[PDB]
Design a protein around this ligand. Sequence first.
Ligand code: HEC
Ligand SMILES: [Ca+2]
Ligand SMILES: [Ca+2]
Length: 106
Amino acid sequence: ADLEDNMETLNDNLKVIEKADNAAQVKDALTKMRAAALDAQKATPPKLEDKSPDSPEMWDFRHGFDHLVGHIDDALKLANEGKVKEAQAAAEQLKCHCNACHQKYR
Ligand code: HEC
Ligand SMILES: [Ca+2]
Ligand SMILES: [Ca+2]
């Protein structure tokens, strides 16, 4: 339930989505990723521990998860429609946003 746990949940469930057989597994994984992203959003990452909680870095860190959740919600709509392959493709759009936050704050 710490930041590192949230990241492990995000990473593990993206791989679940990639390997998924049906829409139910994609939806279940995305729902777990959604919770993890909103939990992570409340953390102070180690790199930013000396910054102000109101700093632009901390607000950029938090905003990154808002957009991640937006992408998760798009993939969730497709998974709820039974479109496994398009839900999976929508979920791959997450990866550039994982990487972008990591490049700044990992
Ligand atoms: C900021 C808005 C983030 C986004 C979006 C994602 N991640 Fe992340 N991640 C972030 C930080 C600050 C860290 C380091 C945390 C620490 O305590 O040092 C990480 C780390 C990871 C890791 C490896 C280390 C770990 O804590 O598990 C992984 C495997 C990881 N993150 C995965 C991941 C994925 C798959 C994401 C998109 C679905 C993703 N992260 C987004 C910050 C942010
Ligand atoms: Ca937590
Ligand atoms: Ca670290």
